[PDB]
Amino acid sequence: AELHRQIWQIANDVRGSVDGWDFKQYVLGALFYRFISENFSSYIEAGTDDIKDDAIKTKGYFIYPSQLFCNVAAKANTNDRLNADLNSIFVAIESSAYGYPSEADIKGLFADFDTTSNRLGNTVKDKNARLAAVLKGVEGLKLGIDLFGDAYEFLISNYAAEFFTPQHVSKLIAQLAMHGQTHVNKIYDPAAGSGSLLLQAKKQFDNHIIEEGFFGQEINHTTYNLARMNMFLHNINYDKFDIKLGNTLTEPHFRDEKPFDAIVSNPPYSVKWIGSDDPTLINDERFAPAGVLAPKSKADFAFVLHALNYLSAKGRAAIVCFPGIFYRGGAEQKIRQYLVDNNYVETVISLAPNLFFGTTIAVNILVLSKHKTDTNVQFIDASELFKKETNNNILTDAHIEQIMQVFASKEDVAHLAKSVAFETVVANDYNLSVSSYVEAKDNREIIDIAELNAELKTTVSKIDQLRKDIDAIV
Amino acid sequence: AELHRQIWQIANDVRGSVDGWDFKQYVLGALFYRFISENFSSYIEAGTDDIKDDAIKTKGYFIYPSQLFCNVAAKANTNDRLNADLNSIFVAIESSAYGYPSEADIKGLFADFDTTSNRLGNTVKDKNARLAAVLKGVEGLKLGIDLFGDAYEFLISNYAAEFFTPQHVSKLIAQLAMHGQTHVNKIYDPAAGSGSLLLQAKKQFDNHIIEEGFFGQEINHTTYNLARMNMFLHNINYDKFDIKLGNTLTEPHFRDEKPFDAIVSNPPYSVKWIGSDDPTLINDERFAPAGVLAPKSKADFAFVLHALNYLSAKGRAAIVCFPGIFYRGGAEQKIRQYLVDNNYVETVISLAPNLFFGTTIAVNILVLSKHKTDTNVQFIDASELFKKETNNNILTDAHIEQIMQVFASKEDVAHLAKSVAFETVVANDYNLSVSSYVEAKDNREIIDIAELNAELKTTVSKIDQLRKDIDAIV
Amino acid sequence: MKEYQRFSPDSVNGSENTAGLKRNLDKDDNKIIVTTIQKLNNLMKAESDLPVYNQQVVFIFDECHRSQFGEAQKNLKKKFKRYYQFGFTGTPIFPENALGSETTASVFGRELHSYVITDAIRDEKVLKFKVDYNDVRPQFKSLETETDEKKLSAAENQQAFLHPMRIQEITQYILNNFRQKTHRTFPGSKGFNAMLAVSSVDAAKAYYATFKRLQEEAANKSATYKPLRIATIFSFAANEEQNAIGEISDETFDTSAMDSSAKEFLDAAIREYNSHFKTNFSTDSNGFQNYYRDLAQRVKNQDIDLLIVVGMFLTGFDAPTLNTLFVDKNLRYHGLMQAFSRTNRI
Amino acid sequence: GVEVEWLPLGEITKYEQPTKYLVKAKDYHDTYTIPVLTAGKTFILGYTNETHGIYQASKAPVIIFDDFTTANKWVDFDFKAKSSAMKMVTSCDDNKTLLKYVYYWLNTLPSEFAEGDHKRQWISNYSQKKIPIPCPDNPEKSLAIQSEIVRILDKFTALTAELTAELNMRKKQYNYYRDQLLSFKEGEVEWKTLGEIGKWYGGGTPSKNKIEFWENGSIPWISPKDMGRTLVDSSEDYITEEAVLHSSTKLIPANSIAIVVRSSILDKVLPSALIKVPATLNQDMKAVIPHENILVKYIYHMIGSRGSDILRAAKKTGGSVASIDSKKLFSFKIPVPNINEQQRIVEILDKFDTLTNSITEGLPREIELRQKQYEYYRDLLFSF
């Protein structure tokens, strides 16, 4: 916010001039093209640096960033060269510009991506003036060590007004994916949405931990596109780093690569699907160990079963849910039964409402492990976090630090949750989680101290009524 | 709702199977084609009636409905002939079908209309199966004396979920356009939206009153299209009956035809336009008598000035506004000054909130006339109308009948509004309308009846406190 | 779900909705319908007034066992008028297969087109055979070479055909020749897994303890012998005839239909399996079936050395990494071909 | 009680769902007559009370409010409605239960019932257990020992109801006795216009963007969401002393009055309060100090008296969300008397409403204290 918040407001000024999604596609494509052009120029000229470049023609040298970054921008079709000939008829060469990095067939393409900026548009001069105004406004963004994509995070958060995460909660669940395990890999994600929650660890651990790039899967088409450009902005290696499109309930991939070592997710809620079910998806590799499916109104735990399928021998897992999936009838009860069949479900931690964007409900996080001791431990958490006005809170680094301290070695802290037993949870009907908050503020008093006070009230009261009777002289 | 409400629910069943606007275009085109085909068959065979027809080729006879209804459907490209060869490859002949009534160059075309049903669509077999399923589902609508378009009114009301009218309010303002004036014409409308409010009078007065067809103007393109098919469904003559596309603030037409005799409208609110203004639109024929324009945040009364421009020597006018345009700074004050310069503004009548689709504000209607007595009369109206659950109310035919009785001859009814004077409105700063609601329910009481009751409260209270003191034995 | 060549392929089921199946009859343009013989028979015996009974109907069948092989066909003759019934099989019936049933050419008709195994072997799709009998024991040489099907059916016992010396020398033969025939002659060699199928459960109950104890003795001979992880599975039973002459009678999924001398024996073997492999499947009506599936998956990756078999893994199971099969059983025309198909894949 | 046994609840309790209602008709004004009774405040207006299949709410059932709450309890008073969410609780047995006994016993346990937190139904869970019961000397004197303690709770509940009633009648008679006196004044008290009484200060609001201007500080902020009191001494918000660099406010003295101009009026009564500390207020209300010819409490009671017609003077001001104009508020005349007709009459009337009002030396100071000792004696009576 030091030199930032002004530029956040500049992006808010650039937000014109129609409904947000339509021009927003062109805005994201513009900043995307600008960042790829600047990164490519930074690679090719870190040392003689040239604003304008040449037709040097050496293909053999050209193919080496086409193996390294996988894409030549072009000889002269960079942004900074194109920024000289702005307002020049015509503008549709940008379509042909998208032909250039989309060659990329060698090797492991990750292309076939940039089909966002279509043409509507009603005349060609409308297209020229509008796209040139967008390029001019995006050129004036004084950004240039080179933190760029947080304004992109702002602009992608400025919609559904989808619901992704308030980003300190993502930092929290990242710290749940902790700790001390330099062990390939991280991180798979079912229903990733944005790459926001898929960012914090390796961005914090750029050379601290060294495992592999990121894998995942996401439902929507345009959300898939913004997710790939989101993960592409943050200066992340080309190595295997991707997400494939599809649904985990319909196209669960990749089984063969691999049993994963850490996962986080934000599954959407009440996501009713085909019932119950017409194919043999009872008899797959992951729902047959449960015993029953996840039907329409209770379509949540299919994601957590798909999550616990793709897990290592040691590496923990962390997902989010809302505490309304509590017992939810006998189907979800026996789902919970197979969950508590072992110490699969390790810990659960509640989180106070809202701490989201107008949802307005509370949530909870489930941390799972095939790394046992074993007893169940329902370390749920109420207040305090502020919630509503600006973000809010957001959020109390000492509070999450001390809840990690609680999560470290199994304390039993009253005015807060504590450990329970397996005998306790079979004494429950596998409830999530009534136990074990205690405090109620039912505070005692004193008989005599109350009653002589009440006698003082009377000694005031009767003489004041007498004085009112004096004042009844009319 | 007798045999209707089931078919309303059948239309609700047909509402599948994607986002509403996209398939809704094809739905409206399908029912439109069905109704034109049935009306054309009813014209050509009211007496030998044939389900399947022939290539009788007699053009000279063909051109006579092409003068009368202006459109031959075709020899064999009617719906009922096309309903035999359903699911037949291919489906795009419907495009060529839209070539047939669009010939229509003689006389006074009213064509160039049916470009709604485009193709998306991803394969040709997708197009065939989808459009054939839509035609099959629209064929099963058992409707067939031949009231058709109220389900069309339902389907067009089922969106923005734009805001048009709850139709009894349109019947009310129609009764404001009353009375007793068999005088060409009716009715011009600026910013008509649908033809719903442009329907009630002549549909009630099919041969009761006989003046002319309807004129109007509307902003949006697709709203213009649905408006023309809306007014076309209700069995209305081809004579001059139309709306042109444009904006009244930019393309005010038609000046030359004519000074109108009755107008109603629903102008949208807070409709900020070009400022203030760059052309010479102060010096037009209608805003120069005011004295100042209608700027951006106060962009309402340009419509009512454009309304009062197109008026006869006698015929009244009725428009809707919201009562927040009250004084609105000195610009709108002097606009109000030129409005009260004569008995231009005759009556104003308020209407209780909401009585709309989640707006949620109150409204009021302004009835204007160059038919004077003259004094101003602010007959505003509060409660009662129910509002929210189903429609609601909707709405109390005796209540609008008695408010027409009040509007007839100028009564002065308390617990309700009444007449005022011109001296009263110059005593106001032309306010709309504080005067003249009176009732406040501030009801008197009695000193002694209250105080001896309070004494009874005390005689209960002190002995019950004594019994509590008895109960303090612990 | 493997029919997803077309997208979408309208691969509809009721499961087990005869009302849903007649709804799919009433629903249009799901122009392929897949159903069982049991669902079809339930539809015919439960409902006899369908509109389909005077309509152009095509039928294709596959994998015919002998429960409703004629009776559902009698309902097909009775409660239909216009059918074109065709068959895919690997099981001819006509000359000497069943001897008491309506044959394939009398069920279906012309041999419309055939693709025999021979030129498929010639075109490198599957591999060749080397079928050898182990004339190795002059004690039971007459009884091994005995061909009296009446006495081999009846006088099969636990001593004249399952003798502990005989079983012991079978075990010694196979443990001597395992790492030779699985190409494990070298330490860094790749290796293959093997199966051993028999005809009686009490044989297998002898075999598991036999292999275990003789591997204990072989490891105690010189403290050098690498043992072999040997697993086994079966439930119940040779329940019916179920087939022609001669195939495997299919095992049903009743867990403890046999005695606990077989059932809890299997349970204790699975407990030792859990103790070595850290698994969770009990022998109930749920963990046994997915236990079978899990054992099927982890026998494929050459992590199980030897599989003792009573009656499973013989028809529908595939193993691309399995070269060598061992038989102590007497077999017939093409159930034996189905047994030999469990190695020959390339 | 000689022999005490705890017993489960649903053993002796008949639970039933509501009889089906369609009570959402087009007008249910006060001219109608049914008691529509819901959670929180248990009263909405009339409706026509017969032939709708109404449950008619017989002699002593109890109810529970509700899904997501299960805490709110109301005695079915006489014969009332089935209002839109209710779940009916009574008992099978008559000669042991007398379920206003267990109405009183049910609010004894706020143990779980201090937790409305998760989206949840609780019907089976409270429907299990427990409650203490004077079994096994039933059916001899089991209800006969109850008549003592249910008489105790009935006298206490009667106390609470009548204290609310006499508070209501007290404010009613008090407002009726205010403006019979002190008004129509003759002869002849000066019709002094408002604002000719003292230069009053407008308002102002700092933005919440600068956390420096917002997070700390000891200037009492005043907002009309925090109004609705009387004689405000402090509020929810304390704003930064640095923030007066751009607050667009004025720091006012500690003997002031204030009055709203937004959104409670345009409908209802406009509040006002004796603000006793130096403070500031927002955009949406006004602060007034008078000037020295007066006694300030007299101005307060004058404004609180004439509120119901000075709202009438400038009521509508448009159909907007906002309210009363500045000028017509400013240009009202009040009778401003001589000083002896300030201090005496304000002494009597101030003594009166300081008898009525919160907190110290007040009727609610009786009300909630008797509520507290009520619940204390309830918890005191119910152990073994």
For residues D57 and D87, the answer to whether their CB atoms sit within 8 Å is no
Which CATH number is C1-115's, of 3.40.640.10, 3.10.20.30, 3.90.870.40, 3.40.50.300?
Answer: 3.40.50.300
Considering CB atoms only, which of B451, B458, B472 is closest to A451? B472
| Element containing residue A367 per DSSP (H, E) | strand A363-368
Cα nearest neighbour of D377 on chain B: B472
Cα nearest neighbour of B462 on chain D: D159
Residue D248 CA from chain centroid, whole number? 34
- B242 plus B133 within the same structural domain: no
Cα separations (Å) of D190 from A54, D184, D193, D290, D292? 92, 12, 9, 16, 16
Residue B32, domain member (yes or no): yes
Test A326 with D118 for CB contact under 8 angstroms: yes
Name the amino acid, one letter, at C41: N
Name the amino acid, one letter, at D38: T
Cα nearest neighbour of A277 on chain C: C15
- B94 plus B197 within the same structural domain: no
Residues of A in contact with C13 (CB under 8 A): 278
Residue A269, domain member (yes or no): yes
Considering CB atoms only, which of A447, A465, A472 is closest to B474? A447
Cα nearest neighbour of B447 on chain A: A472
Considering CB atoms only, which of D361, D369, D370 is closest to A460? D361
Alpha helices, DSSP H, located in A162-204: 167-177, 200-204
3-state secondary structure of B456: helix
Nearest to D86 by CA among D108, D106, D67: D67
CATH assignment of C116-346? 3.40.50.300
Cα nearest neighbour of A454 on chain D: D366
For residues B238 and B291, the answer to whether their CB atoms sit within 8 Å is no
Residues of B in contact with D169 (CB under 8 A): 450, 453-454, 457
DSSP per-residue letters across C291-312 = HHHHHHHHHHTT--SEEEESSS
Tokens of B317: 């006018």
Residue C97: CB atoms within 10 Å: 20
- A174 plus A49 within the same structural domain: no
Test A458 with B472 for CB contact under 8 angstroms: no
- B196 plus B148 within the same structural domain: no
Test A342 with C12 for CB contact under 8 angstroms: no
Tokens of D253: 């003295």
B162 is in an annotated binding site: yes
Residue A122, domain member (yes or no): yes
Cα nearest neighbour of B470 on chain D: D152
Quick one: A100 exposed, middle or buried, by C-beta within 10 A (0-12, 13-18, 19+)? middle
For residues A135 and A26, the answer to whether their CB atoms sit within 8 Å is no
The nearest CA of chain A is from the CA of B188 a distance in Å of 31
Residues of D in contact with B443 (CB under 8 A): none
B166 is in an annotated binding site: yes
What method did the depositors use to determine the structure?
A: cryo-EM
Cα separations (Å) of B181 from B202, B261, B263, C154, D246? 13, 9, 13, 113, 64
Cα nearest neighbour of A289 on chain C: C290
- B143 plus B21 within the same structural domain: yes
In the 8-state DSSP scheme, what is residue C85?
A: E
Residue A453, domain member (yes or no): no
Cα nearest neighbour of C17 on chain A: A278
Distance CA D379, CA D374 (A): 9
The nearest CA of chain D is from the CA of B365 a distance in Å of 13
Backbone angles phi, psi at D341, to 5 degrees: -90, 10
Furthest C-alpha separation in chain D = 80
Residues of D in contact with A468 (CB under 8 A): 352, 355
Cα nearest neighbour of D120 on chain A: A324
Residues of B in contact with D26 (CB under 8 A): 386, 392-393
A275 to chain C, any CB pair closer than 8 A? The answer is no
B433 is in an annotated binding site: no
Tokens of B318: 């009725």
For residues A21-58, b (16+ Cβ closer than 10 Å) or e, as one string?
eebbbbbbbbbbbbbbbbbbbeebeeeeeeeebeeeee
Backbone angles phi, psi at D144, to 5 degrees: -75, -25
Nearest to B90 by CA among B62, B137, B128, B59: B128
- Give the contacts of C142 (CB within 8 A, at least 6 positions apart): none
Q: A337 — alpha (psi -120 to 50), left (phi > 0) or beta? A: alpha
Residues of B in contact with A465 (CB under 8 A): 458
- Domain edge (last residue) among A131, A156, A181: A156
CATH of the domain at B202: 3.40.50.150
Cα separations (Å) of A107 from A67, A69, A71, B121, B188? 7, 10, 10, 34, 67
Q: Which residues of A are annotated as a binding site for S-adenosyl-L-methionine?
A: 162-167, 194-196, 218
């508590």: which residue's tokens?
Answer: A340
- A401 plus A300 within the same structural domain: yes
Alpha helices, DSSP H, located in chain C: 18-26, 37-46, 71-78, 104-107, 117-122, 141-144, 149-154, 164-181, 201-222, 260-277, 287-300, 335-340
Helix pair A447-470, D364-381: axis angle to 10 deg: 150
Distance CA D301, CA D230 (A): 11
- A259 plus A393 within the same structural domain: yes
Considering CB atoms only, which of C1, C290, C293 is closest to A279? C1
Tokens of C254: 């009743």
Q: Is the peptide bond before C246 cis (omega within 30 degrees of 0)?
A: yes
Residues of C in contact with A341 (CB under 8 A): 280
- B137 plus B197 within the same structural domain: no
Question: Matching CATH topology for C1-115 and C116-346?
Answer: yes
Nearest to C265 by CA among C183, C202, C338: C202
Test B457 with D165 for CB contact under 8 angstroms: yes
The nearest CA of chain A is from the CA of D330 a distance in Å of 35
**Choosing among D155, D323, D325, D377, which should be mutated to test the B contact, i.e. which has the most B CBs within 10 A?**
D155
The nearest CA of chain B is from the CA of D277 a distance in Å of 34
The nearest CA of chain A is from the CA of B363 a distance in Å of 28
For residues D280 and D247, the answer to whether their CB atoms sit within 8 Å is yes
Test C280 with A291 for CB contact under 8 angstroms: no
Test A288 with C290 for CB contact under 8 angstroms: yes
- Domain edge (last residue) among B117, B133, B156: B156
Residue A443, domain member (yes or no): no
- A152 plus A171 within the same structural domain: no
Test A440 with D370 for CB contact under 8 angstroms: no
- What residues does each domain of chain C span? 1-115, 116-346
For residues A155 and A106, the answer to whether their CB atoms sit within 8 Å is no
- Give the contacts of D118 (CB within 8 A, at least 6 positions apart): A323, A324, A326, A362
Residues of D in contact with A389 (CB under 8 A): 208
The nearest CA of chain D is from the CA of B464 a distance in Å of 6
Residues of D in contact with B386 (CB under 8 A): 26-27
DSSP per-residue letters across A27-66 = HHHHHHHHHHHHHHHHHHT-----SS------HHHHTTHH
Test B468 with D177 for CB contact under 8 angstroms: no
**Choosing among A256, A278, A293, which should be mutated to test the C contact, i.e. which has the most C CBs within 10 A?**
A278
Backbone angles phi, psi at B174, to 5 degrees: -65, -45
Cα separations (Å) of A131 from A119, B137, C101, C163? 10, 43, 80, 90
Residue B115, domain member (yes or no): yes
User: Could you report how far apart the first and last alpha carbons of chain B are, in Å?
Assistant: 70
Residues of B in contact with A451 (CB under 8 A): 469, 472
**Choosing among B455, B459, B469, which should be mutated to test the A contact, i.e. which has the most A CBs within 10 A?**
B469
Quick one: D58 exposed, middle or buried, by C-beta within 10 A (0-12, 13-18, 19+)? exposed
3-state secondary structure of D341: helix
Residues of D in contact with A323 (CB under 8 A): 118-119
The number of folded domains in chain A is 2
**Choosing among B118, B448, B452, B462, which should be mutated to test the A contact, i.e. which has the most A CBs within 10 A?**
B462
Identify the domain containing residue A257 by its residue range. Answer: 167-427
**Choosing among B445, B456, B462, B473, which should be mutated to test the D contact, i.e. which has the most D CBs within 10 A?**
B445
Interface residues of A toward B, Cβ cutoff 8 Å, are 447, 451, 458, 465, 472
B40 is in an annotated binding site: no
For residues C98 and C75, the answer to whether their CB atoms sit within 8 Å is no
Distance CA B384, CA D27 (A): 9
Instruction: Give the chains touching B; criterion: ≥3 Cβ pairs < 8 Å.
Output: A, D
- B144 plus B217 within the same structural domain: no
CATH of the domain at A101: 1.20.1260.30
Residue A394 CA from chain centroid, whole number? 15
Q: Is the peptide bond before A187 cis (omega within 30 degrees of 0)?
A: yes
Distance CA D194, CA D326 (A): 11
Residues of B in contact with A458 (CB under 8 A): 465
Distance CA D373, CA D23 (A): 40
Tokens of B114: 């049916």
- A76 plus A223 within the same structural domain: no
Q: Which domains does chain D have, with CATH numbers?
A: 5-155+377-379 (3.90.220.20), 190-364 (3.90.220.20)
Q: Is the peptide bond before C237 cis (omega within 30 degrees of 0)?
A: yes
- A90 plus A208 within the same structural domain: no
**Choosing among A461, A463, A466, which should be mutated to test the B contact, i.e. which has the most B CBs within 10 A?**
A461
Distance CA D55, CA D17 (A): 11
- Domain edge (last residue) among A156, A183, A211: A156
DSSP per-residue letters across C159-214 = SSSS-HHHHHHHHHHHHHHHHHHTT-SSTT----EEEEEES-HHHHHHHHHHHHHH
Name the amino acid, one letter, at C322: L
Size of interface A-B (CB pairs under 8 A): 7
Nearest to B222 by CA among B119, B118, B303, B104: B118
Strand pairing class (B317-321; A244-245): unpaired
